[PDB]
With several copies, the nearest count.
Chain A
């Protein structure tokens, strides 16, 4: 986040495994994996997407 020190806010970053409709609203997104990020306290956020698959390898 590259705003001013006087700005504040909160964000939700979500990952959804495949199979269902792509999320279009926060209510659908929060049901999958998600992280809540506070801009004021921290200027950077990190989210780890883990390996969850049916096959051992995925195509490029």
Chain B
């Protein structure tokens, strides 16, 4: 074989069913990257509410019709005002947690339509102005209500009082990539002719073992209608969509006074 000896001392120089959680119960699931949520490994005492925070919280129901273009949420932003989980978030400097997301949508055998649910790590969205990275904290953290997609890019032509809001586009996924490839991310498809619910399990993903839960969002959830809703020969159709999220294996550290962000 060919001979090789490394000269320098540095390595760089070298040549190259029912699910019950806590006091909540909901009656196949998808695990992101095949990794179940877990606590920090062996390699300041953390606080861990075993059941006061690891349970299912239900968000506000939304309506799906013939003109809906999609919805998106950010985690852990969406759960900032849910029981003691939010209190622990705002009373500590460092936090960590995984999630279990459950999407519910029921219809009849005479309806038709398909929804795509995508879980995206580090889901960064585009703005609505010539200025770059000018979106504000308040607009980037809607909370429980979340946001919506659009079919076109509407530039905010107002220099007097810029809105500083996102302008996602459905077929660009709001980030400049084609929607067809979004299936690279963890995903589920709800087809009304086969099923009525979707489930995803998300572990903690980040470049650090633990990070602030207030200034950084680890996950994004996007729901988009792949096929339009229809029902018999009716002009208008509307059905509800519900989202339920459960924290799992949550840890907090850095206890001090409480944080009170200015949301408008």
Mark A residues whose CB is within 8 Å of B: 6, 8-10, 16-21, 23, 26, 28-38, 40-41, 50, 52, 54-56
C-beta contact mask, B247-264 vs A, less than 8 Å → 1, else 0? 000000111111110000
Q: Is B181 an interface residue (CB 8 A)?
A: no
Known A8-B106, A54-B208: A19·B24 in contact at CB below 8 Å:
no
A25 to B, closest residue via Cβ: B257
Name the B residues within 8 Å of A55 (CB-CB). 208
Contact (Cβ within 8 A) B257 A31? yes
For residue A6, give the distance in angstroms from its CB to the closest CB of chain B.
Answer: 8
B259 to A, closest residue via Cβ: A20
Name the A residues within 8 Å of B24 (CB-CB). 34
C-beta contact mask, B52-92 vs A, less than 8 Å → 1, else 0? 00000010000000000000000000000001000000111
Q: Is B234 an interface residue (CB 8 A)?
A: no
Name the B residues within 8 Å of A10 (CB-CB). 104, 106
A37 to B108, CA, bound (A): 17
Q: Is B93 an interface residue (CB 8 A)?
A: yes
B25 to A, closest residue via Cβ: A35
Q: Which of B19-75 contact A (CB under 8 A)?
A: 23-27, 44, 58
Contact (Cβ within 8 A) B106 A19? no
Mark B residues whose CB is within 8 Å of A: 23-27, 44, 58, 83, 90-94, 104, 106, 108, 208, 210-212, 214-215, 253-260
A10 to B239, CA, bound (A): 13
Known A8-B106, A9-B106: A20·B257 in contact at CB below 8 Å:
yes
Contact (Cβ within 8 A) A17 B26? no
A41 to B212, CA, bound (A): 40
Question: Which 9 residue pairs spanning A and B have beta carbons closest together?
Answer: A32-B256, A17-B93, A17-B254, A20-B259, A28-B257, A54-B211, A16-B256, A19-B93, A31-B257
Known A20-B257, A30-B58, A31-B257: A52·B208 in contact at CB below 8 Å:
no
Name the B residues within 8 Å of A18 (CB-CB). 93
Contact (Cβ within 8 A) B44 A52? yes
Contact (Cβ within 8 A) A33 B212? no
A-B contact sample (10 more), CB < 8 A, given A19-B92, A52-B44: A17-B254, A17-B256, A20-B257, A20-B258, A31-B255, A32-B257, A36-B26, A54-B94, A54-B210, A54-B211
**Residue with the greatest number of chain B CB neighbours at <10 A, chosen from A8, A20, A29, A56:** A20
A17 to B58, CA, bound (A): 20
A19 to B104, CA, bound (A): 32
A10 to B104, CA, bound (A): 10
Contact (Cβ within 8 A) A36 B259? no
For residue A39, give the distance in angstroms from its CB to the closest CB of chain B.
Answer: 10
Contact (Cβ within 8 A) B104 A21? no
Known A10-B104, A21-B260: A36·B93 in contact at CB below 8 Å:
no
Name the B residues within 8 Å of A38 (CB-CB). 27
B209 to A, closest residue via Cβ: A54
